[PDB]
Every structure is written in C-alpha cells, then in structure tokens.
C-alpha cells in the first residue's frame with residue numbers, strides 16, 4: 001500500500017490504502033475502483049495495453065512488484081508438476097536438478113514463449129501423472145494438516 | 150613476591166595480596182585442575198586481571214600440555230588496551246626473575262577500523278566502510294590483478310605480508326594495538342592479519358566478545374585449534390545481552406528499501422557481467438555444484454548443496470521473492486506479531502519458498518557476490534543483513550521469535566516499521582564456546598547471584614565463588630536512602646514517578662549531597678524521559694539553581710558527540726575545584742563505557758531502580774521464554790536485570806588503589822531483602838542494617854563523616 005497510486009486514477013490510494021493490487025496475465029497493477037472502470041468498457045481489457053482477458057483475469061494479490069506477481073502465480077501452477085519429494089531421488093546431484101529445472105521453467109514462462117514449455121509439460125504428464133503426481137497430491141493435505149497442528 | 154599456592158608456586162609482581170586474592174587463585178586453580186567451566190566474581194577491577202593472569206602463567210608453565218592458549222576477552226577495546234599493560238608488566242617481572250627470554254607471546258586483536266596503516270582507510274571511521282575498502286584491496290581479483298602488476302592501487306602491506314608474514318612468525322613479545330600498528334609500519338605488514346596469524350602460536354590472545362560469540366566472525370578466528378584453552382571473559386555480567394544481540398537481526402523499512410535499490414544494482418551488475426564476462430565467471434556455477442560469513446554455528450551450519458538457487462538470475466529472483474514477502478509482511482498494520490516457526494511456514498506457503506534452499510541463501514549470496522567483482526560490500530551491507538536474517542529464520546526457530554512492530558513506540562504513527570528477530574536465550578550462541586573449549590571462566594564484577602547464570606546459560610559450573618575485598622581501610626561506604634526529610638516513600642515506581650514529592654526528594658538529596666561531596670559526582674536515572682521530567686521539575690523549582698550554585702551540573706543525551714564533549718568537560722571540572730554533577734541513565738551507553746576513579750564520581754547516586762519499559766514486546770518475548778523454560782519467575786529475572794545493572798554502573802567508584810568512594814541508592818526498594826540478596830557480595834556485606842534506611846539528611850551527615858575518616862592519610 002506504499003505505492004504512489006494507480007497509473008491512471010491515483011486518487012483512491014491517497015484517500016485510503018484499503019485497495020489491493022489485482023493480478024492479471026499482463027502482470028499489471030490494477031485497483032478495485034479502476035477495475036470497475038475496466039468492466040464497463042471492454043470487460044476484461046487492460047486500459048493502456050489492451051491485453052484481452054477471458055473473464056477479467058482478476059485475483060487478489062498484495063505484492064506491489066508486478067513481475068513477482070506473475071512469478072508467484074506461475075510458480076503455483078508449476079508446483080503442481082515435479083512435486084515429488086527429495087527422498088524419491090537417490091542420487092545426490094539430481095536432488096536439486098529438478099528444482100533447478102523447475103526454476104528454469106518458471107523463468108521461461110514469465111518471459112520466454114511457453115509453447116516449448118507447454119509441450120515439455122505434456123511429456124512429463126504422460127509419465128508422472130500415473131504415480132508420482134497423484135501420490136503427492138493426496139499426501140499434500142496430510143502433511144499440511146499435521147504441520148499446522 | 151612469589152606465592153607458594155597449594156597447587157604450585159605462582160609468581161606475583163606486586164608487593165602484597167589481600168586474603169581474598171589467596172582465595173581467588175586457589176578457587177581458579179580448582180576449576181582449572183578440574184578442567185571444567187566455572188564462574189566467579191572478584192570486586193577489584195584492577196589487580197583482578199593480574200591475579201587471574203598470574204595463575205595462568207604459572208599454570209601454563211606447570212602444565213603446558215593441559216592448557217594450549219589463554220583467551221582473555223574484555224568488553225571494550227579501550228578497556229582491553231589497559232589489560233595488556235598489566236600483562237606486559239607481569240611478563241617483565243616474570244622475565245626479570247628468570248633473567249632470559251621465554252617462549253611467551255601476547256597480543257590483542259581488533260577490527261581493521263580500529264587499527265590499520267593503509268592511508269585510504271585511515272580517514273574513514275565507519276566500521277562497515279573500512280571492511281569494504283580492505284575487502285576490495287585484498288579481493289582475489291585485485292590479488293590476481295596484482296600479479297599482472299597493472300596500473301591500479303594495490304595494498305602493498307598485505308601483498309608483502311603473505312610472502313613474509315607466512316614464512317616468519319614473530320618469536321615473542323607484547324604488542325598493544327598502538328604498538329602493534331607501529332610494528333606493521335616498520336615491517337610493512339598488516340597489524341590486523343599479522344595478529345591473526347599469530348593466533349596459531351600465541352600463549353595469550355585477547356579480544357572483545359564480538360570476536361568470540363557471533364559465529365559469523367568468531368568461529369573462523371576461533372577455530373578448533375584451541376582444543377583445550379583457558380577462555381576467560383572479564384566484567385561479563387551482561388554477557389547474555391551481548392551474546393543475544395549477536396544473534397538478533399533487525400529488518401526495517403529503510404533497510405528493506407535500501408535492499409530493493411541494492412538488489413536493483415545487483416541486477417544491473419549481473420547484466421554488465423553477462424555481456425562482458427560470462428564463461429570465466431560461469432565456472433563458479435560448477436564450483437557451486439561441486440561444493441561476511443554465515444551466522445550458523447559449527448553444528449547448525451550446513452553446506453550440503455546450494456539447492457535450487459544456482460544462478461544469479463535464479464538466485465536474484467529468490468531474494469526478490471523473499472524481499473517482497475518481508476516487505477508485505479512488514480507493511481501490515483496491526484498489533485505486534487510473534488511467529489517464530491510460523492513465519493517460515495507462512496513464507497514457504499505464501500511465495501513457495503522451501504526452507505532448505507533458503508538456508509544456503511546467505512552463503513550463496515557471498516559466493517555469488519564474490520563472482521560479481523563488486524566495488525565494495527558497504528553499499529550492499531543491508532542486503533547481506535537481510536540474507537543473514539533470511540538464513541537464520543530458515544535454519545531454526547526453537548529458541549527464537551520473529552517480532553514485527555508496524556508502529557514504533559514513542560510515536561503515534563511512524564512510516565518506518567522495524568521487524569525484530571530478537572532471540573530469547575543466550576545459551577544457543579554461546580553453546581559452541583563451552584563445547585569447543587574445555588573450561589571457560591566467566592570472571593566479572595558487580596555480579597548478581599551466580600546460580601542464575603547456569604539457568605540463563607546452559608552449563609554446569611564447577612564452582613560458585615563470591616569474593617569480598619578485604620582491606621585495612623573500609624574504602625566503600627554504601628547506603629540506601631528510601632526515606633527523605635518528609636519520611637515519604639521515595640520509590641521511583643511507575644505509578645509513583647509522577648509524585649512531586651518523590652521528584653523533590655531526589656533534588657533535595659542531590660542538593661544536600663552536592664554540598665558535602667567533593668569534586669566529582671555522578672547521578673544515574675532510570676530512563677532519559679524520566680530524567681528530563683526530573684530535570685524539568687528541578688529546573689522549574691529553585692532546587693536546580695541551588696545545585697548549580699553548589700556545583701556544576703551536566704546532563705547526558707542520546708547522541709554520543711554531546712556525551713563525549715560533556716564527559717570531557719566533566720573530567721575538567723573535577724581537576725579544577727568546580728566539580729561536576731553528571732546526570733546519566735543507567736542503561737545509557739555512557740555509563741557502561743565510562744569508568745570512575747579517584748576524585749571522579751566520588752558519590753555515585755542511583756536514583757531509583759533501573760527498569761526498562763515493560764511494554765517493550767521484545768523484552769516480553771525474552772522474559773516470557775525464561776519463564777517458559779529454565780524455571781525463572783518473570784519478576785525474579787526483571788529484578789535480577791535491574792540489580793545486576795544497578796550494581797554494574799555503581800561499582801566503578803572502587804576501581805582500585807583503595808581510593809575512597811561512597812555509593813548511595815536513592816530508593817527504598819533496594820533496602821528490601823530480595824534486592825540486597827541480588828546485590829554483589831562486596832557491596833552487600835559491607836552494607837549494614839543500621840544505615841540501610843538512612844534519611845536524606847541523615848545519609849548526608851554520615852557521608853560527611855565518612856569523607857573525614859577517608860580524608861586523613863594511612
């Protein structure tokens with residue numbers, strides 16, 4: 001809430017900081033009062049960029065850094081892949097190789113074309129979906145619940 | 150003056166020793182013979198080091214294999230400088246008795262900022278700036294560039310030190326910091342590094358606590374070489390505060406904003422490097438795969454693998470993500486938040502940051518930072534602080550706590566919140582010292598009862614010995630004045646602080662005492678805000694003007710520059726007949742730093758018990774844990790901290806040479822049995838019940854009588 005104001009309507013922030021950033025595929029700061037301005041005309045179009053949005057492409061985020069918003073949001077989807085625990089990796093070198101590869105994919109998606117990344121993800125899907133992906137999904141809730149308690 | 154101690158014969162330079170000294174040496178020998186860590190108290194500030202040192206010298210000669218080296222630490226470098234003088238005097242006396250040189254070496258370490266010979270760093274005074282310059286001059290790139298002998302300033306002292314200092318070690322001698330600096334100039338070697346090399350073979354090595362407690366720097370210089378060394382601390386009553394402060398790291402909005410800008414510079418630096426130097430510097434990635442210092446101690450420290458973060462572009466985003474989480478988590482406006490283990494979970498879940506990759510971030514930053522050939526680390530110092538905090542939280546939180554203060558005290562609304570990571574137990578950071586070194590002797594003065602320290606610090610002392618100075622003349626004359634001329638309670642209670650009579654009584658006591666007390670006197674309050682209110686009340690009344698007429702009065706402020714000038718003027722007043730009344734705060738840096746000697750602080754005045762603002766959450770977390778673990782009552786420790794601190798500042802008047810000096814406690818609380826018990830033995834035992842509750846005017850009269858007896862010669 002320390003930002004000077006919205007690029008277009010920098011008046012609501014000065015009055016109150018209750019407004020929060022809205023994340024979009026544009027990786028593009030937006031504010032609730034300004035969101036209504038987008039709905040009236042275009043209905044899911046960035047004001048200056050004009051990037052189309054399927055249904056408003058809006059979710060609540062509170063990180064003033066635009067690039068990080070995409071990185072964090074992209075990372076959530078990436079976590080769904082290559083989520084196997086370290087114990088599944090016997091070799092010492094491969095422990096972080098997947099993590100290094102996983103982090104590499106994140107950077108490619110943020111800036112590089114995702115066509116190659118999407119194609120690669122399909123290759124892993126055909127193999128990992130059978131056992132490793134399903135196993136960790138079920139176990140995610142178990143570990144999370146125990147850790148919270 | 151050789152002393153035939155029961156354990157062995159111990160040489161002693163000075164003419165005579167008091168009976169307490171006999172107990173001191175044998176008590177110390179008992180712990181040394183048992184090879185077990187212990188704690189002891191000796192009143193005299195001077196003569197305690199030589200007595201402590203004297204036994205070690207005899208013990209080393211008797212059992213050289215038992216003890217490798219002596220590690221005698223002191224609180225402040227200005228105070229360690231005088232210590233080595235005592236050792237130098239002892240060595241000459243011992244050497245004179247033998248008649249020939251002996252394989253004994255003694256030196257004192259310190260920061261490059263305090264001692265150095267390089268002209269470029271000489272004008273600079275800030276410690277952080279000195280390291281950046283020295284690091285750049287001694288940087289591997291400069292050293293590698295030095296081989297090319299290209300046109301660029303290369304710090305000659307280190308270059309020739311490596312070729313010379315490595316080959317030839319200094320046989321023996323005593324070199325203070327001032328003397329050590331001169332030796333480097335004539336020999337063209339670093340006063341700092343030369344001392345560092347000498348630690349390999351140096352019978353006596355002395356340096357401040359911050360060179361022996363914080364794992365970032367202490368561990369490297371304090372390597373396992375000291376398998377069995379007699380590590381000793383001096384006046385280490387506030388060891389926990391120094392020990393805890395080493396672990397505690399503070400992250401602020403101003404610091405965070407600096408990190409973001411510094412990170413941007415780091416990002417720009419990488420971009421320049423990528424276009425200029427890629428292949429050669431990329432080799433460090435292979436080194437990272439193959440496998441400023443981390444704050445993790447020996448066992449806690451881990452170096453398995455760098456983790457996911459393996460490249461500058463990847464690692465920088467890692468800090469970017471972590472910085473944002475702290476930025477947002479800090480900007481939150483709410484009550485003070487405590488979340489030792491949950492912050493790691495919250496950070497991990499919020500931005501998908503696993504702890505294990507985050508543990509190596511601080512080490513990776515240094516390794517990555519080195520690859521960047523940066524000009525200096527001073528600019529990026531805040532970023533490392535966050536990195537140090539970043540790795541510390543990810544490492545362990547069992548005995549820690551993340552404290553976030555969206556709103557700071559003394560301010561209705563401030564846009565500069567500070568994220569505290571204050572520790573709660575000092576045993577964690579001091580644990581390696583006890584294990585690495587066979588025995589540690591925590592020698593200190595004005596020590597509140599010994600039994601607490603094993604509770605505060607997880608250790609089993611061999612002995613708990615309290616020593617009271619024994620002299621032909623009773624130098625110290627302590628007293629407590631809880632009742633004034635109005636026979637009204639004078640306790641400086643938080644609810645009673647607003648009382649005008651209590652404020653008036655203190656002015657009356659000081660005014661009356663100033664009349665009888667000769668040149669040189671000091672008054673200690675509880676806090677700066679309370680001090681100003683008391684000063685203002687006296688200023689409005691004629692009490693302050695009367696005090697001004699009786700003697701000059703000096704007040705203390707937060708800024709050191711004002712304190713330094715005022716203190717120098719104070720010392721001038723005592724030298725002349727004017728005399729000076731230096732009002733100070735017990736917990737202020739001035740009190741601990743300054744030492745009061747003959748005709749200086751003749752009548753130390755303790756105005757009210759020294760207590761901190763209980764609303765301070767950081768203290769609450771520390772206080773709460775001690776109640777949760779180690780079984781210490783919340784009030785017991787709080788009183789203990791005040792009693793230990795009240796005795797700390799008031800015990801300087803009796804430094805040594807049996808210079809008469811009285812101590813007056815202006816609070817009825819001290820008269821309570823609990824307060825007296827926590828009082829140091831030497832101060833406590835001299836204090837009697839007859840004078841325990843002296844009236845303000847009655848106390849003045851006895852003080853006048855006391856001066857008369859001390860005034861006459863022996």
Ligand code: SF4
Pocket residue numbers: 261265266267270282283284286287304306307338339340341342
């Ligand atoms: S290398 Fe030695 S002489 Fe040069 S700045 Fe550093 S400490 Fe001083």
Ligand SMILES: [Zn+2]
Pocket residue numbers: 006007008009010030031033034035
């Ligand atoms: Zn807007």
Ligand SMILES: [Zn+2]
Pocket residue numbers: 026028046047048049050051
């Ligand atoms: Zn846009």
